[PDB]
Amino acid sequence: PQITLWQRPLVTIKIGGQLKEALLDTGADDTVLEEMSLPGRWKPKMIGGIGGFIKVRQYDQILIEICGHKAIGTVLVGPTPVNIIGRNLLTQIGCTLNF
């Protein structure tokens, strides 16, 4: 579809059988989500934001559906203010900027 930016670009995602809400963020390289349980083993990571660094748990090859589109890649879990969909997954669904 086409999304204008007069209000926050929020979308529904289906992950692990449940529906959740997330923000489409072109400035982020990675996808970051709130504290939840995921299958498999994990590895550690530090990412910096506008207010400092945070430690996160990294999970690879997770399936996640965004507005009917399917993607499979890395997802990070940690203390974030909202769920974030970043460039790593925006490229899989073929999303672009237009002005």
Added chain:
Amino acid sequence: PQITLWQRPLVTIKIGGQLKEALLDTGADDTVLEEMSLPGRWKPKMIGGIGGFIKVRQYDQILIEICGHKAIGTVLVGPTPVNIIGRNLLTQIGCTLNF
């Protein structure tokens, strides 16, 4: 124009007669710039994100040139790690997100 997201979406902007490079961010409500001097009165504020809150100085009605287009709007000045162009200026040059 159409921009892909295989790499970071960086652009050059002109403010206060100074050249700067910035990141197009659909997730940010406002525009936040690194510590610099601007003319006028300003009000202190707190904005939060990944990692916590930061204190900034808010200036209103600042003119900015972004990739050939003029725009007017609020600008927040403070210790952000990188220059960010948010939704309040992006809407003014009619940028949309498409997939």
